[PDB]
Design goal:
The structure is cut from a larger assembly and holds chains A (132 residues), B (56 residues), C (178 residues) and D (143 residues).
Chain A: E1 4-13, E2 18-26, H1 35-46, E3 53-60, E4 66-74, H2 77-83, H3 86-92, H4 103-114, H5 120-131
Antiparallel strand pairs in A: 1-2, 2-4, 3-4
Chain B: H1 8-12, H2 28-39
Chain C: H1 20-33, H2 39-60, H3 66-82, H4 100-105, H5 108-114, H6 121-129, E1 133-135, E2 138-139, H7 149-152, E3 155-157, H8 170-176
Helix pairs in contact in C: 2-3, 5-6
Classes of the chains: A alpha+beta (132), B mainly alpha (56), C mainly alpha (178), D alpha+beta (143).
The structure holds one RNA strand of 312 nucleotides.
RNA sequence: AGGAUAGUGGCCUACCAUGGUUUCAACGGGUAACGGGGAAUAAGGGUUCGAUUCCGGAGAGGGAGCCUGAGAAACGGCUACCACAUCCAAGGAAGGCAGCAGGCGCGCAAAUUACCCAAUCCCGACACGGGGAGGUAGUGACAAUAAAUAACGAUACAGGUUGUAAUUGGAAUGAGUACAAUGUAAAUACCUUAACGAGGAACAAUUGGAGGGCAAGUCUGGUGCCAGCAGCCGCGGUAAUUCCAGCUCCAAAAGCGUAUAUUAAAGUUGUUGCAGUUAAAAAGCUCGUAGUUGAACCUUGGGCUUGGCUGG
């Protein structure tokens, strides 16, 4: 319902090939506007690639009806993939979440491996020799 | 001295159950109740003010 | 670790707990501004104590003292802005003459009732706390919100409030549709 | 000349004189001599847990005529044996022998209170349960 | 003079002199003593505290000695002894939570064996790896901030044009419950917000107290110097304003009481600012050293020129 966006504090940053600004969201009679929709709305206004638009840090003012955030647009989708943080790419569907076990499992692996010198194949081969 | 007479009066006191009364207003509404009562409907008997008058 | 976050107390209790002159006078003050508890009188008394204390040190300094001159107008300007200090009393001497009644005059609850938006002073708080009063385009539910002069003329109901053109409330929809 | 030196170069004499004379003040002497740390049964603390050795009722002082009901408690931290009062109506029975009781002071700063002779402590809890709640039956003793 | 050191220096050695500190407190003892920035309280002056978010020092069970390395007398490095302690096949081997979490003890006394490198930064061969450093969540009434438990009407008595005490209603909202969206490394929570969600609106506020100090009963029932209460003074010995209950009322309020220490009150530690004939306290009296304190007196007046700021 009459979702109007205002961008202030705009600074052009060719050093990273992106333009950054503070986004003021006016969404009366609305709970709040999702991050994905403002990507289509902002990209169409600036005629830029949706996948090259990053928006985050949204906090709604008291009483509702107005939101503020921070906006990012890149000169290409490739630029967005190169410099935007990995978790943001997961949020926008531009990349997949890397699969790893919990921090406990990785830490106990490294300590267990440190008790072994050389290749892991040799140590078990000697271990297989020892008990047999 | 002995320990025999411990807890005498509390033991032989007849039990009375507290009467159920509607809850008084709390906080600000109670704060209203204290203002209107001693500063709107003054109960002085020509300058005679007793806060908790016993039945007399 | 992280740097500590500064905080300070905003109220203080009197040294003498039971003084019928003070006990009734506070009720006379709290009762007709509809303040919930005596601590809000304490908060005004605490803040007024250090406003007087700040002006006292400046008044001890010489006239044309740069510290008195700089801090004198800034402190006075901050009071003239909130409407506590009259515009003609910019002398740092009427600052000491200030009374806790003036500060309680600039509260939102006080102003909402005095602007006709509420039937009584008690109706102002319940109306405020239920998210109905909006200052300008911002909804405020703090009864102790002190009012600046530039915001006095902008005190009204929220545009989305059921009392000012908003949607029908919870009780209305449950009853009007059954 | 008020008896005390007034010279501008007499700061040592003034500082020494006051320092010696503060030992006449009872509060200051107990702090620096550390009497509460050395000799007080609580060792300078506020509360103290102990073991009830028996239950004893003590005659009140004059002009009152009564029998104040206390207990004899042996302390865990320092091995001392003291007497602790039980302030309420009828919870002498709630405190038992060989029981764990938390104690406190009478508020008189190590001195005897009222008509109770030779007693400086009161029972705050027994078996981990507040005696005030037990008297009001807000809880029951764990046994 | 030499040795040793990164280098000065009794830091160590040889020879030689008898020096050095001290009533302006040396040396010795205690410290319930890491130091400071600071904290609490404070009219001012002060008093107490400072293990603890920063800086500096020390320690890694207690000593001691070293390797590597620019940098260590390092302990998440080693060696030896001592005190403990684990596996053992009895031959041996491996130990250091005052790091994060957790366990026992000691206690008056203090948190989860949770998630993560996304933020701050650090380290490396370094855009990429690692970081219980750090950050996030859990317990949290250590404290601090804001702030619900109702507001408005009519019938009707009472009352001096309106403030109420009952039975008569319609509206409002978030505590809560929740689609969803944001928030976030991923979440939770906050914030926004569809829908549900308030009459005994049981969606029920508590802690203390009612003789004085100190605010609020000479009410009712219970016992009868017993029980007990009472910080102090006292209450209780048969109509208890003071105990135990009811009723009522008072203070503060999501907080209130109790214990201990400290600060103010304390001009009861007094420099500001005490007292000393009789309430505590002028040495029996002189001498006298350090200390403290010590008569007056040395270019004043006059004359001229000019700048600035105060009210005109």
């Amino acid at each position: 319902d009459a979702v109007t966006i205002r961008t202030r504090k705009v600074i052009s940053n060719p050093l990273l090939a992106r333009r950054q600004f503070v986004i003021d969201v006016l969404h009366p009679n609305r709970a709040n506007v999702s991050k994905d929709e403002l990507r289509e709305k902002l990209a169409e206004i600036y005629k830029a690639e949706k996948d090259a638009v990053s928006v985050f840090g949204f906090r709604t003012q008291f009483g509702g009806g107005k939101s503020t955030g921070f906006g990012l647009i890149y000169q290409s989708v490739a630029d967005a993939k190169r410099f935007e943080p990995a978790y943001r790419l997961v949020r926008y569907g531009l990349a997949e979440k890397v699969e790893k076990a919990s921090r406990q499992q990785r830490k106990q692996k490294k300590n267990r491996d440190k008790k072994i010198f050389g290749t892991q194949r040799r140590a078990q081969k000697r271990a297989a020799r020892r008990n047999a | 001295g002995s320990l025999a007479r411990a807890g005498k009066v509390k033991s032989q006191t007849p039990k009375v159950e507290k009467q159920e009364k509607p809850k008084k207003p709390q906080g600000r509404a109670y704060m209203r109740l204290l203002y209107t009562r001693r500063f709107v409907n003054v109960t002085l008997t020509n300058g005679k003010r007793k806060m908790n008058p016993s039945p007399a | 670790p992280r740097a500590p976050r500064t905080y300070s107390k905003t109220y203080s209790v009197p040294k003498r707990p039971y003084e019928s002159a003070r006990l009734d006078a506070e009720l006379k003050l709290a009762g007709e501004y509809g303040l919930k508890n005596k601590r809000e009188i304490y908060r005004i008394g605490f803040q007024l104590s250090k406003i007087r204390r700040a002006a006292r040190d400046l008044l001890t300094r010489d006239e044309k003292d740069p510290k008195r001159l700089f801090e004198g107008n800034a402190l006075i300007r901050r009071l003239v802005r909130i409407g506590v200090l009259s515009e003609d009393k910019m002398k740092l001497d009427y600052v000491l003459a200030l009374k806790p009644e003036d500060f309680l005059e600039r509260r939102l609850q006080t102003q909402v009732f005095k602007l006709g938006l509420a039937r009584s002073i008690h109706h102002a708080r319940v109306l405020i706390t239920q998210r109905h009063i909006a200052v300008g385009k911002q909804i405020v539910n703090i009864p102790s919100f002190t009012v600046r002069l530039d915001s006095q003329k902008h005190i009204d109901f929220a545009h989305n409030s059921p009392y000012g053109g908003g949607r029908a409330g919870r009780v209305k929809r449950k009853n009007q549709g059954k | 000349g008020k008896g005390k030196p007034r010279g501008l170069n007499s700061a040592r004499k003034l500082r020494v004189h006051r320092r010696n004379n503060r030992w006449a003040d009872q509060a200051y002497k107990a702090r620096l001599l550390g009497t509460a740390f050395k000799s007080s049964p609580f060792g300078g603390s506020s509360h103290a847990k102990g073991i009830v050795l028996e239950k004893i009722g003590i005659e009140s002082k004059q002009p009152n005529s009564a029998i104040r009901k206390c207990v004899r408690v042996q302390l865990i931290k320092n091995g001392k044996k003291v007497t602790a009062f039980v302030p309420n109506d009828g919870c002498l029975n709630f405190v038992d022998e060989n029981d764990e009781v938390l104690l406190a002071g009478f508020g008189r700063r190590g001195k005897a209170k009222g008509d109770i002779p030779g007693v400086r402590f009161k029972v705050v809890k027994v078996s981990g349960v507040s005696l005030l709640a037990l008297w009001k039956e807000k809880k029951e003793k764990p046994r």
